[PDB]
């Protein structure tokens, strides 16, 4: 016999330097208040009369979600180096995928009136971001002559140049359910302190495809080995998860969105004070 | 010449600390009793008259499958500072009966006209499995909060339009086979620390199903800290749903089609600081 | 200058302990004799009148292919404490004739009108192969328990609605070429410890087929313990099914189209504790 | 207690030997000037009357984008045994404005009837980019040699049926922004030793487009010999085309839709034997 | 300061033991001569009257391309214990002219009505290439044994219904450019020990084509014993077929469309025991 090691499993409370946060963000498809009958969907998509006359109704435009998570305060005085929270990894999941596995919800029939109803399908757009400040946005639209509703943030002084990349069309994703997906995208010329990931599939009637698991972690460190650094001890979580459109019996259509869960691991770092 | 080693093959028993279990779970599409004519399928999908009047008929809603496997007893009682627990380390899993879909003579809607083969199972698919040391924790979320769910399934309590998004009060455990509808419940990503789950969804009205099968693939169940599910009360929970698509009848009524899933799980005995008070 | 090595290429005869075998298996879609006009295809798919009246015609049901390859004799008898056995370590396999589908002049249904090319083979596809040291073990599972299978195929005995899911009594061995229907039998994942199998299915009414071909890919057959299939009685079992889709005739009758599969298996001699009583 | 290291985060200015450039290139689908109503789209696609009579209207042909970026001057003396050159070692690149396609209210053909959303941009897609130390070298190859190309694009000289395959005389340099049609010119794989290019095509009449976007991906530009593009005359060439699909109007006329592309290229100073 | 190394970039000629060859192969869809109006396409596909009466017209059948490249002469004496042979170790290969498909004005069938663009090339695709030290070995297998093949292509001898599966007598060598039909012949996996081949097929009536292009990818040609194709008689065999789909005319007649393929093969001299 000899003295040797054996590994016992127990609850381990992680180092003081490491923290995890969890959050969920509900979708902002247009009906953005939980009391609303069509919460989690847009209102019926109203189409343009013409190029010149294109005025989407209130609540018909899906917008990005954003949540600001206040982390534990690290610095008593900001005058010294300072400590900052560095986001190192994230686990994220689209919640409610299985809700689409439903052929009895009222709408257009797959075949005739004896069949199931057409499920959510068409254009999809799934993106998330984790950063130490608001996601920086670039404006670009399909048509500069659309008139955007009062309750969304649109491009200022829109002109045909906004159908391409105009460097004046910039914004911060600093309000939940206010920045339309069809107007704003991540600005790749900025966002040095944010990591973002997105996938788009278009088409009129395309089948949606989504996976879900609790086994996958995305590392947030950049090419220099540094994760997002949380300015003022605030963590920004942003996303949009448009699953497709639901078609009603009358052939009116509404966007369907799903919520997203985030689990972010952060660590305390010593940072030279700007 | 010299003395040297040669490797002889033989049956090896493996150590007492490791065990393997195998199980299969039959699908729960609505007709959940093997004596039923449409066992392995739902009843005909009945669609809503309206947003307000949406009452799925009994046995038209696919539900999750779950089995609880009783593992070998490890402890005399729960009084010691440490106990032994089974740790699930890996799983091999297979959807069974995929080839049954390779059938164009089953009665139904014709591909072309009445001289052609019949349309096979297609449309929305949903395949998921989980292996854990306790029930899979579920989150409720529905397409429509005004649906009236049948008494024989577990629905969200006191549904409101908020349940079309994530309401933290809509939570459940997958603790009954063939009772929790797929369209109401999904894995809760805010919990499930002691379960591993994996899922794939493809929608669309008539989409072709795609499935693979092999006995060569093993999934490791260890988490980011190197620890597998730990089996509380020496029970292993296997959960799944495998909706292959819908079958369309000649009259255009449609039924969900599900397939069984096989599991082979490897577990090892571990010393664990006693969690039980 | 100095003495040094240079690598010269030459024909090398491998060690006596290693052998390779090559074989091809022609498809068994229904017309299984090379003299038949529709060899490599099924007969026209006849569809069910009803759930209760569903009687596939003779030769309309694709079946698995199987070949048993007799390997070199290794033992004088089975009396010693150890014996020699062939261990299958790797396989190269290819579906042959893929390019034959690149044909829009074969008579059939038109893509557009009567001036256009004809619709090529498309729809449901099913590709699988197995390499083992004994027959592939099969599980039965059908779309409909009330189908009446023809006398010339091996069907599930005393079929009941439970056979639309997994019934553990519905088991068979793939021990006859062109006799076990693909739509009735699939690999049994609860057995097959001495076989490796691999399969892919894509369904749908008219889905485009996708196939690749190369001589650059080798699949390793060693299991999780580093052991390949061990060939009982010095026999190697090769199994497959390769359904490319259906061909549609102008009258809209449809026939399954299959393709042959080539195998190149590498085996090595091993000393094995004698399993034979 | 002991002396030891701790890793402090700070703003680090990269070594003098390394530089990064950022640029964006707007699409050149035919309406190539930001004052134009249909900027970012082609004009309506006019189809051939016949094989012999096929005359695309001006600005109906999507063309490649190119930008030449002037890098810091490295050599005041070009007569030494060696010179310095900028070597492009990696690139991050993104298609911008993908989310603009997530729009079912823009006027056009209806998905179902007049109560539904309108059909989004779909059909043929073509996405490519290149990073090089000199212009991208092009090979000409067309669907039909009897097409008559307009005078505002560069096309194949003395076109003949052989140009429906590879004729080695049909060669060009991508040296004008918005003038070389995608349907006439492709990268020449027999040249381009000093460029890296990457492209993806999916055809079909009405195919759904698929596009990803992230700031997490870097492509290494070093070749098989470990050498990146070397920038002749301290000029960096960025080339691309990003056709997202076509938009269909209610009248069923169709226009190509393109999107801009962003580039972030890292370069390092290298000693090079003087040519 | 000290003596130290710095890596200077320069033009290097590889060792005398290594050579690179570049080639392109134009497609052989039926119109195989660059003077033909429809060069790069087949003639209109004529469909069978029946099972028994199926006679494809001349030049309606896409065929494989092959080029035999003469390499530098290695042995003036062929009677020693060893000879030198070229060993192919890697290949870079690209389909050329993919962008030519990004064309909706070419005359044909309309996507929607007569105001819209025309349907692009789509349907069945077949892409393969091979690099070897001798002709690619072929296996014959057809959709229908009662087809009558024309006298300008090489087909199966004494065709019988068994040729709808694998009959071991139906074997050939790919030794003539543009004469072996794709629909009759495939690589023989039971031979081809001295060739590497790679192929991809996607069928369907109207399927969208998918193709990528880059100059960044190298395929290693070494087999499982670390040996590449050895070039018998100092000849390198390049084979391919690249069927992009079919073009549909307004009358609904259809023609196959093929594209050229580029090859860049690296070879090294090896000492080989004299056979
Ligand atoms: C996303 C969703 O739940 N859509 C509903 C839809 C909406 O509630 C409605 O369009 C918003 O005003 O309503 C659907 O059911 C309708 C009935 O509620 C109504 O009584 O009659 C309608 C007849 O055209 C229709 O049946 C719908 O529009 O199809 C059901 C759908 O799920
Ligand atoms: C999933 C399945 O087996 N579906 C059957 C279907 C069901 O048995 C039935 O719809 C509900 O129990 O029955 C099908 O055959 C029918 C005949 O059994 C009946 O006599 O007449 C019907 C006429 O519309 C029909 O032919 C069906 O509904 O198509 C066959 C199908 O496979
Ligand atoms: C898979 C195949 O070869 N199919 C053939 C088909 C078969 O020979 C037949 O269905 C077996 O009974 O025959 C096709 O051609 C037919 C002619 O042979 C017949 O003279 O007239 C038929 C009229 O509908 C038809 O044209 C077919 O059924 O389309 C040709 C097909 O490739
Ligand atoms: C790509 C794009 O923005 N297309 C517009 C289109 C263009 O403005 C037009 O083709 C360029 O000359 O115009 C569409 O709207 C049209 C109205 O502006 C016009 O008053 O009437 C037309 C009736 O057929 C049509 O409604 C269009 O052609 O559909 C809108 C489209 O987004
Ligand atoms: C692949 C190709 O270029 N196809 C052409 C086609 C060919 O020139 C023809 O099939 C060769 O025999 O011709 C198309 O244009 C035609 C006119 O040239 C002719 O004057 O009238 C035809 C009326 O049906 C037709 O418009 C064609 O057949 O559509 C154009 C096509 O691109
Ligand atoms: Ca910047
Ligand atoms: Ca939690
Ligand atoms: Ca077992
Ligand atoms: Ca060259
Ligand atoms: Ca051989
Ligand atoms: Cl703005
Ligand atoms: Cl609840
Ligand atoms: Cl049985
Ligand atoms: Cl030219
Ligand atoms: Cl022959």
Tab-separated table of N, CA, C and O and ligand atoms in Angstrom, chain A residues 139 153-158 162 168-171 184, ligand 11:
chain	number	residue	atom	x	y	z
A	139	UNK	N	-26.411	52.015	-40.532
A	139	UNK	CA	-27.718	52.064	-41.197
A	139	UNK	C	-27.591	51.698	-42.659
A	139	UNK	O	-26.664	52.149	-43.325
A	153	UNK	N	-36.406	54.155	-34.183
A	153	UNK	CA	-35.279	55.018	-34.520
A	153	UNK	C	-34.824	54.660	-35.939
A	153	UNK	O	-34.377	53.543	-36.186
A	154	UNK	N	-34.961	55.610	-36.865
A	154	UNK	CA	-34.594	55.390	-38.269
A	154	UNK	C	-33.365	56.213	-38.600
A	154	UNK	O	-32.873	56.969	-37.763
A	155	UNK	N	-32.886	56.060	-39.834
A	155	UNK	CA	-31.769	56.868	-40.343
A	155	UNK	C	-32.179	58.343	-40.522
A	155	UNK	O	-33.238	58.653	-41.085
A	156	UNK	N	-31.335	59.253	-40.036
A	156	UNK	CA	-31.626	60.682	-40.148
A	156	UNK	C	-31.315	61.187	-41.553
A	156	UNK	O	-30.330	60.781	-42.148
A	157	UNK	N	-32.170	62.062	-42.072
A	157	UNK	CA	-31.979	62.676	-43.393
A	157	UNK	C	-31.736	61.613	-44.457
A	157	UNK	O	-30.751	61.667	-45.195
A	158	UNK	N	-32.627	60.633	-44.523
A	158	UNK	CA	-32.432	59.512	-45.438
A	158	UNK	C	-32.390	59.990	-46.898
A	158	UNK	O	-33.125	60.910	-47.285
A	162	UNK	N	-28.353	55.820	-48.737
A	162	UNK	CA	-28.580	54.880	-47.635
A	162	UNK	C	-29.026	53.489	-48.067
A	162	UNK	O	-29.209	52.615	-47.221
A	168	UNK	N	-22.313	58.321	-42.503
A	168	UNK	CA	-23.047	59.168	-41.562
A	168	UNK	C	-24.176	58.423	-40.860
A	168	UNK	O	-24.648	58.859	-39.811
A	169	UNK	N	-24.611	57.304	-41.436
A	169	UNK	CA	-25.734	56.548	-40.882
A	169	UNK	C	-25.250	55.564	-39.800
A	169	UNK	O	-25.016	54.387	-40.063
A	170	UNK	N	-25.053	56.088	-38.592
A	170	UNK	CA	-24.546	55.293	-37.485
A	170	UNK	C	-25.372	55.527	-36.244
A	170	UNK	O	-25.937	56.601	-36.058
A	171	UNK	N	-25.464	54.495	-35.416
A	171	UNK	CA	-26.238	54.581	-34.178
A	171	UNK	C	-25.667	53.614	-33.155
A	171	UNK	O	-24.759	52.817	-33.470
A	184	UNK	N	-30.915	48.686	-39.487
A	184	UNK	CA	-29.629	48.700	-38.792
A	184	UNK	C	-29.004	47.333	-38.749
A	184	UNK	O	-29.684	46.326	-38.492
F	11	LIG	CL1	-28.536	58.283	-38.946
